[PDB]
Enzyme design. Sequence first.
Site, PDB file in Angstrom:
ATOM      1  CG  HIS A  17      -1.723  -1.256   1.390  1.00 11.37           C
ATOM      2  ND1 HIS A  17      -2.718  -1.648   0.523  1.00 11.37           N
ATOM      3  CD2 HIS A  17      -1.714  -2.170   2.388  1.00 11.37           C
ATOM      4  CE1 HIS A  17      -3.245  -2.783   0.943  1.00 11.37           C
ATOM      5  NE2 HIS A  17      -2.664  -3.115   2.080  1.00 11.37           N
ATOM      6  CG  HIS A  59       2.404   5.768   6.342  1.00 13.33           C
ATOM      7  ND1 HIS A  59       2.043   5.627   7.664  1.00 13.33           N
ATOM      8  CD2 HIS A  59       1.391   6.439   5.735  1.00 13.33           C
ATOM      9  CE1 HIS A  59       0.842   6.157   7.835  1.00 13.33           C
ATOM     10  NE2 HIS A  59       0.408   6.615   6.677  1.00 13.33           N
ATOM     11  CG  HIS A  97      -0.957   8.620   2.259  1.00  9.54           C
ATOM     12  ND1 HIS A  97      -1.766   7.510   2.189  1.00  9.54           N
ATOM     13  CD2 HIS A  97      -0.655   8.789   3.572  1.00  9.54           C
ATOM     14  CE1 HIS A  97      -1.982   7.054   3.411  1.00  9.54           C
ATOM     15  NE2 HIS A  97      -1.296   7.791   4.268  1.00  9.54           N
ATOM     16  CD  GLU A 115      -4.280   9.592   2.936  1.00 12.20           C
ATOM     17  OE1 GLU A 115      -4.030   9.563   4.162  1.00 12.20           O
ATOM     18  OE2 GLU A 115      -4.786   8.647   2.295  1.00 12.20           O
ATOM     19  CG  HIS A 159      -0.081  10.396   7.417  1.00  7.66           C
ATOM     20  ND1 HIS A 159      -1.031   9.706   6.689  1.00  7.66           N
ATOM     21  CD2 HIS A 159      -0.343  11.716   7.239  1.00  7.66           C
ATOM     22  CE1 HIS A 159      -1.840  10.588   6.113  1.00  7.66           C
ATOM     23  NE2 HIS A 159      -1.451  11.804   6.438  1.00  7.66           N
ATOM     24  CB  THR A 165      -6.287   8.044   5.759  1.00  9.48           C
ATOM     25  OG1 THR A 165      -4.966   7.563   5.563  1.00  9.48           O
ATOM     26  CG2 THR A 165      -6.265   9.296   6.598  1.00  9.48           C
ATOM     27  CB  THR A 166      -5.218   2.638   5.222  1.00 10.10           C
ATOM     28  OG1 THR A 166      -4.663   2.346   6.507  1.00 10.10           O
ATOM     29  CG2 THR A 166      -4.271   3.541   4.482  1.00 10.10           C
TER      30      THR A 166
HETATM   31 ZN   LIG Z   1      -1.231   7.693   6.286  1.00  7.44          ZN
END
Ligand SMILES: [Zn+2]
EC number: 4.2.1.1
Length: 258
Positions: A62, A92, A94, A104, A117, A196-197
């Site tokens: 992911h 991690h 995005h 995000e 994040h 958010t996942t």
């Molecule tokens: Zn995140």
Amino acid sequence: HHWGYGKHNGPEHWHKDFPIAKGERQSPVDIDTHTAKYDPSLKPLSVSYDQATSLRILNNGHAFNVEFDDSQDKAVLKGGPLDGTYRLIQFHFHWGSLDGQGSEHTVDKKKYAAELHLVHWNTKYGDFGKAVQQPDGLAVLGIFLKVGSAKPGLQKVVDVLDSIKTKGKSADFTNFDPRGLLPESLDYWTYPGSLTTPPLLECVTWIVLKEPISVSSEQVLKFRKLNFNGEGEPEELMVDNWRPAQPLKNRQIKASFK
Ligand SMILES: [Zn+2]
Ligand code: MMC
């Protein structure tokens, strides 16, 4: 469970296995800067990363995660909107397929190229797993990335990505200093939200920094060479691994700054 970011398993599908996806405090959100209210009662954020002990970097299919030792109060976040102490467990990112998307959170509908994040859990709950059963279990420090000059503190991350191209690959990543990923200012917005996942759990005090960090085009290009797939499966570039803004519902976003 079997979720991702493509047409067939992306954010529009998540609610079937994870009904909380349509819940009352989902993340990310658009931050409307003209509705966010300066809160003079908010304390300064305290980012205490001096003793941070990074362990491994992992491609989880992911994103990639840099994981830390969270057994003791080595790298912690305190103050601001937070009561007590939150321990850093991982960070991690995005990011997008092109520079005009990838974040995000959005700011007045603006999408940044990426979003970092730094994930922390509330030490009053003893472990991360217990913390995600609590509405104040997590604090995520979110930092926007724009493309400009290189971020030197990011380069060690970029340099290792060749070794974790595909899902399930990991590498030693000890002695990494996350302080090198921060902008100058700790001005922030804060609101109550979620992961958010999947599993999209509603545990998070979000703290989103106003000042983006700048990273180079060459740095983000290397993010975009990662793969969602495992080795031996059709190649699918790891890009656009972001969830869009979700309904604010009955929430208030507070600003730490005027
Ligand atoms: Zn995140
Ligand atoms: C309840 Hg998280």
